[PDB]
Short mmCIF file of C-alpha atoms in Angstrom, two decimals:
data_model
loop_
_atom_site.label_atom_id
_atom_site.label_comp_id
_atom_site.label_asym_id
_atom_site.label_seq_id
_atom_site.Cartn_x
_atom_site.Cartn_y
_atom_site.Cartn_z
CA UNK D 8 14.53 -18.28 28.98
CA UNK D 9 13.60 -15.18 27.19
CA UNK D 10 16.83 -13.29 26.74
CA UNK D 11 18.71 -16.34 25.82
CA UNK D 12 16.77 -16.86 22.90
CA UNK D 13 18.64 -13.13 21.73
CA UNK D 14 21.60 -14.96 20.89
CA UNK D 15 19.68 -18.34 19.32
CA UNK D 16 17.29 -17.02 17.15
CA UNK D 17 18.74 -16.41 13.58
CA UNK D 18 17.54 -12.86 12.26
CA UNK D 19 16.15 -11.28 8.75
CA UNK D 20 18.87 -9.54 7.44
CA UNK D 21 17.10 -7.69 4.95
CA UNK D 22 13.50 -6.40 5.25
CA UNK D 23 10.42 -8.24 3.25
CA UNK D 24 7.80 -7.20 1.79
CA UNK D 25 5.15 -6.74 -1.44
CA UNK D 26 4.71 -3.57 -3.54
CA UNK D 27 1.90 -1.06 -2.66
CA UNK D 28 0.31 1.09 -5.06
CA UNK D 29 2.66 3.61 -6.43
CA UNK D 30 5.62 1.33 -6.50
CA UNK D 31 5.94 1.88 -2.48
CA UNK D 32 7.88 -1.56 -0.51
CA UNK D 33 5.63 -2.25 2.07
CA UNK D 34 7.53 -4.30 4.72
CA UNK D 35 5.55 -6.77 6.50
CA UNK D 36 8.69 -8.05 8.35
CA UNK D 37 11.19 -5.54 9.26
CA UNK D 38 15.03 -6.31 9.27
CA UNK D 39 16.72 -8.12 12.33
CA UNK D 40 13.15 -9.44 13.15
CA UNK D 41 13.92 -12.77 14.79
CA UNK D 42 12.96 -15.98 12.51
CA UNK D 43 11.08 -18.33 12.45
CA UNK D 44 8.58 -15.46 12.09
CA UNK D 45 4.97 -15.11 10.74
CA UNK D 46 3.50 -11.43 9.86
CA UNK D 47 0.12 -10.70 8.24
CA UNK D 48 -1.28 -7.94 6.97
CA UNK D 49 -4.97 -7.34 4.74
CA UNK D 50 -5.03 -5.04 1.87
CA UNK D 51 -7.58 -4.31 -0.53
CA UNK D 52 -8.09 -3.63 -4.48
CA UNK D 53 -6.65 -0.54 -6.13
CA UNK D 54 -9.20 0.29 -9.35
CA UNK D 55 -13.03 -0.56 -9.71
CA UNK D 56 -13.80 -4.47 -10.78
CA UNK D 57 -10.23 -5.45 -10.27
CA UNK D 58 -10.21 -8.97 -10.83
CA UNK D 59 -7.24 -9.84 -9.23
CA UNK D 60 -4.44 -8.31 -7.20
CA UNK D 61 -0.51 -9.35 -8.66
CA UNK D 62 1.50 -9.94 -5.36
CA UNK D 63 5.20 -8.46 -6.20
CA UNK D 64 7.77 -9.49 -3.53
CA UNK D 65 10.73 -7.61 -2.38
CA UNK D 66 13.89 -7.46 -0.29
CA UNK D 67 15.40 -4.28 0.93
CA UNK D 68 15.46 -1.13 3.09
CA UNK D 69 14.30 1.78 0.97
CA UNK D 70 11.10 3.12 0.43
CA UNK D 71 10.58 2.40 -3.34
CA UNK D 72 10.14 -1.51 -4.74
CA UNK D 73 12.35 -0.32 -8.09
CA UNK D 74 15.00 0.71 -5.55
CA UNK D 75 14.82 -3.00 -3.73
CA UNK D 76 15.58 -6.37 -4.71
CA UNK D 77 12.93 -8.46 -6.62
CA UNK D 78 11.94 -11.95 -5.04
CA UNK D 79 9.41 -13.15 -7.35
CA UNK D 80 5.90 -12.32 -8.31
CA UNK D 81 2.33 -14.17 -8.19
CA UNK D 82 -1.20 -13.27 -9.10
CA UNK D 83 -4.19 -13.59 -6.53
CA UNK D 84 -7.48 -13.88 -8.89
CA UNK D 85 -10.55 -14.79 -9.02
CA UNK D 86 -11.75 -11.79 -6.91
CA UNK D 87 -15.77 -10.68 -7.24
CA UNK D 88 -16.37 -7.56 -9.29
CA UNK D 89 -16.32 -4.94 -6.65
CA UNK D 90 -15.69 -0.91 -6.14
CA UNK D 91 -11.74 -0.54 -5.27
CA UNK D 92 -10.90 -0.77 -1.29
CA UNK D 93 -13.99 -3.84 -0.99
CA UNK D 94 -12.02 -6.89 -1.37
CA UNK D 95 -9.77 -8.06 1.72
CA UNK D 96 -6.82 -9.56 0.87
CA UNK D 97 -5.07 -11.72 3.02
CA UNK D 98 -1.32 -11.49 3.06
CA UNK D 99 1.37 -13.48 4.95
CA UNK D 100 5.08 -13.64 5.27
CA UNK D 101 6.49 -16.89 6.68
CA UNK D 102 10.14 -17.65 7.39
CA UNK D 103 10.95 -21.21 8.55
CA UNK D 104 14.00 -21.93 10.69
CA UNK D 105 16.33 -22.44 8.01
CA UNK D 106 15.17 -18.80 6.38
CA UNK D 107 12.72 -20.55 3.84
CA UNK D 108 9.97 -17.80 2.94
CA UNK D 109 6.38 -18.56 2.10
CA UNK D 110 4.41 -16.07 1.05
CA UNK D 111 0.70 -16.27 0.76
CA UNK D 112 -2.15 -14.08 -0.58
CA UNK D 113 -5.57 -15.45 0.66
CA UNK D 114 -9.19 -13.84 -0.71
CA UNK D 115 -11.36 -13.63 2.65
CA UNK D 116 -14.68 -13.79 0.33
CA UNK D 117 -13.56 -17.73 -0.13
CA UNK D 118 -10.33 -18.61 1.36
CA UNK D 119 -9.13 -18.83 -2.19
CA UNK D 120 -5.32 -19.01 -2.15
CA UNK D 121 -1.88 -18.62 -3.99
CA UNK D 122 1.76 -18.38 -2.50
CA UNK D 123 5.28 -18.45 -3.83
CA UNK D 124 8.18 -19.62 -1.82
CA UNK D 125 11.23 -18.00 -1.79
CA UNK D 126 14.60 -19.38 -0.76
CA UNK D 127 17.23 -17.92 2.24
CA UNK D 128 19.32 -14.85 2.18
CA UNK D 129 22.39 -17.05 2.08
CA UNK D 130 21.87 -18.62 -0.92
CA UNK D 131 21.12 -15.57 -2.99
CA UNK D 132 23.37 -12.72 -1.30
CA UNK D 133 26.84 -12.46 -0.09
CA UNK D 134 27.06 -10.50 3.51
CA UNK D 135 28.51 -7.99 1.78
CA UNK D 136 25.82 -7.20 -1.03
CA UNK D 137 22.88 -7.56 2.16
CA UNK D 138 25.75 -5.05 4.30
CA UNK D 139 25.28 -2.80 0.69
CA UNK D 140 21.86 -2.80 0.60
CA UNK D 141 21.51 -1.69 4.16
CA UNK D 142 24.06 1.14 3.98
CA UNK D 143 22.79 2.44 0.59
CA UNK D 144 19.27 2.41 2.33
CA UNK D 145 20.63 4.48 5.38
CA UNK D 146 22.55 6.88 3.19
CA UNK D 147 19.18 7.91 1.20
CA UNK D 148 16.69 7.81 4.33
CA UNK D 149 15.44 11.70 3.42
CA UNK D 150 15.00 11.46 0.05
CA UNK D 151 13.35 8.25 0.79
CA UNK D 152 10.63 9.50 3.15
CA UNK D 153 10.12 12.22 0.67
CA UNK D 154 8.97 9.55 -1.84
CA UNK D 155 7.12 7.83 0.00
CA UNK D 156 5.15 10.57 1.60
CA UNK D 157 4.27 11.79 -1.97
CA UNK D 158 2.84 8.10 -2.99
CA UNK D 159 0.88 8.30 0.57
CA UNK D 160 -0.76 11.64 -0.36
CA UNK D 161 -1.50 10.77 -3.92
CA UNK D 162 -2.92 7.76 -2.54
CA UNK D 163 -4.72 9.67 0.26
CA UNK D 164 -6.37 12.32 -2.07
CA UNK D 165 -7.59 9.79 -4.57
CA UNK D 166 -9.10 7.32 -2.04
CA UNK D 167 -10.60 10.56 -0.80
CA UNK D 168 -12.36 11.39 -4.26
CA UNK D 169 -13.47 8.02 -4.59
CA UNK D 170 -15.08 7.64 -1.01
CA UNK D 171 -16.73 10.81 -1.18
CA UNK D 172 -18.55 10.10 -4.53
CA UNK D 173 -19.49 6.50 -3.18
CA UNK D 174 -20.92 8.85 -0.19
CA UNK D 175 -23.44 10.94 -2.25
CA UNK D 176 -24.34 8.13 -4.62
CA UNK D 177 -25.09 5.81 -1.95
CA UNK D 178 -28.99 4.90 -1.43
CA UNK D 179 -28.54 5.60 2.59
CA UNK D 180 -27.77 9.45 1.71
CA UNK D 181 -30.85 10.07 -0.75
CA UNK D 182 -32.81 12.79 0.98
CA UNK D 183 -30.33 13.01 3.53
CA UNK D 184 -27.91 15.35 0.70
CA UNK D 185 -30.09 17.84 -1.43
CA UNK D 186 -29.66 16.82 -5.57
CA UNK D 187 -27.90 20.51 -5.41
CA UNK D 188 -25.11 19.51 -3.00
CA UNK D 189 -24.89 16.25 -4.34
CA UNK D 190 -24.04 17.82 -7.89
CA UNK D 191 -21.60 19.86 -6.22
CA UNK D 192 -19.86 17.48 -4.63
CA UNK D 193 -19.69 15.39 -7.55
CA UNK D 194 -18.56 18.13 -9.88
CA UNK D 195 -15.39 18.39 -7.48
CA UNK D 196 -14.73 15.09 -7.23
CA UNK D 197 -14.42 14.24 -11.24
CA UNK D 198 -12.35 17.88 -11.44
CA UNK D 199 -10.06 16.33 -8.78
CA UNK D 200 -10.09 13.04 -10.85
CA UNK D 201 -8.90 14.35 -14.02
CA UNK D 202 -6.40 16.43 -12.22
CA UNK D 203 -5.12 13.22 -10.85
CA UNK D 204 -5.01 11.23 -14.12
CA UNK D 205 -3.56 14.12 -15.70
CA UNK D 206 -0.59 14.91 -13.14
CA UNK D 207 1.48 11.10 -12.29
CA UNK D 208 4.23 12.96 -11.07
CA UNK D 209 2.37 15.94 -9.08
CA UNK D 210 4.47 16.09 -5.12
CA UNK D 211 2.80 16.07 -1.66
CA UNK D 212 2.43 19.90 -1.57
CA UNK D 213 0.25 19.39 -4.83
CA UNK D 214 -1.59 16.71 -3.93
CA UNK D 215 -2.47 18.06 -0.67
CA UNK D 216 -3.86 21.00 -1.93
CA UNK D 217 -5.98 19.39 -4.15
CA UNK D 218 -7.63 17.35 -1.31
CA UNK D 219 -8.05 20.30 0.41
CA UNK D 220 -9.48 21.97 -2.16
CA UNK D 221 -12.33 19.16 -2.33
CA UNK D 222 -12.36 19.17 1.27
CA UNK D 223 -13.54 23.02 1.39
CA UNK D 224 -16.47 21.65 -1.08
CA UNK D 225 -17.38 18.77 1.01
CA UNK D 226 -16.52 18.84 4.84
CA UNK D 227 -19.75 21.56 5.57
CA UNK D 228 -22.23 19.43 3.25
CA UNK D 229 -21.15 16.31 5.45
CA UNK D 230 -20.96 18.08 8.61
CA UNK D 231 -24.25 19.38 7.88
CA UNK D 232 -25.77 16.00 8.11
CA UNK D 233 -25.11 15.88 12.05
CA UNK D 234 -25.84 19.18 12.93
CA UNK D 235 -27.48 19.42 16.23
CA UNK T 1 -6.09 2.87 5.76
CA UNK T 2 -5.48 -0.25 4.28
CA UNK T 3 -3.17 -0.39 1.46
CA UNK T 4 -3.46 -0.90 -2.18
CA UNK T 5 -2.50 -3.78 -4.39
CA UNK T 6 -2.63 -3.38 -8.06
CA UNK T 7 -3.74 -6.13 -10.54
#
């Protein structure tokens, strides 16, 4: 009943998925997942006003898009001016029973849609290029997680500038932060932005003392707003 | 968390 449909059920060979921010492949259906298959997964706008978000699609096992096969690309727009992380993004991978992929980016504000469909493995790879991919993948799995632990933290730290400014400049904190902390808060957070705009290639070690660096500023002013 | 999409 359940354990007979182990040996019906076709598989994904390869892993799917869309590009992240900082060229990461995020995977929203992992290899040998059983098909037909549906995965979804919301994500949100990377800069300020971003009109749009440009859905790249890609096939593979290692942690970086550049390193993984291209599928095909489409752009999600009409999206309301907005800071980055408001928009939610809709995104779904579907694979039919004959390995037919549909992939869908939907803006929750209006149900506003665009998709792409992509055809199956079998028709693009031979077993032995999809065998490649996977054992190339496997022999790089370190250096791998090393990239995309960097991307995370750079990601991490920025979001982490960003929110705390929104914090002090939003209308529920006035009187609630003194103008004093507020300025130093903010001072930190544009030194932490130009540090980030002017080091792309900074690693985790960097980037994590950077946001702990802001952290030291900020963590007592917003601690101090729930003393007892 | 949720992740980024550039445009």
């Amino acid at each position: 009943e359940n354990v007979q449909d182990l040996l019906l059920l076709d598989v994904a060979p390869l892993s799917l998925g869309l590009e992240t921010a900082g060229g990461v492949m995020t995977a929203l259906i992992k290899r040998n997942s059983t098909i037909p298959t549906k995965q979804t997964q919301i994500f949100t706008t990377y800069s300020d006003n971003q009109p749009g978000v440009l859905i790249q699609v890609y096939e593979g096992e290692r942690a970086m898009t550049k390193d993984n096969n291209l599928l095909g690309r489409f752009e999600l727009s009409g999206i309301p001016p907005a800071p980055r992380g408001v928009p939610q993004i809709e995104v779904t991978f579907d694979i039919d029973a004959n390995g037919i992929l549909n992939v869908t980016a939907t803006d929750k504000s209006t149900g506003k849609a665009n998709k792409i469909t992509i055809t199956n493995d079998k028709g693009r790879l031979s077993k032995e290029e999809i065998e490649r991919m996977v054992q190339e993948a496997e022999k790089y799995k370190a250096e791998d997680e090393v990239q995309r632990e960097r991307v995370s933290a750079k990601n991490a730290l920025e979001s982490y500038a960003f929110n705390m400014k929104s914090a002090v400049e939003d209308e529920g904190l006035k009187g609630k932060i003194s103008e004093a902390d507020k300025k130093k808060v903010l001072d930190k957070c544009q030194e932490v932005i130009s540090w980030l705009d002017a080091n792309t290639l900074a690693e985790k070690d960097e980037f994590e003392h950077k946001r702990k660096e802001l952290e030291q500023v900020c963590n007592p002013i917003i601690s101090g707003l729930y003393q007892g | 968390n949720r992740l980024l999409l550039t445009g």
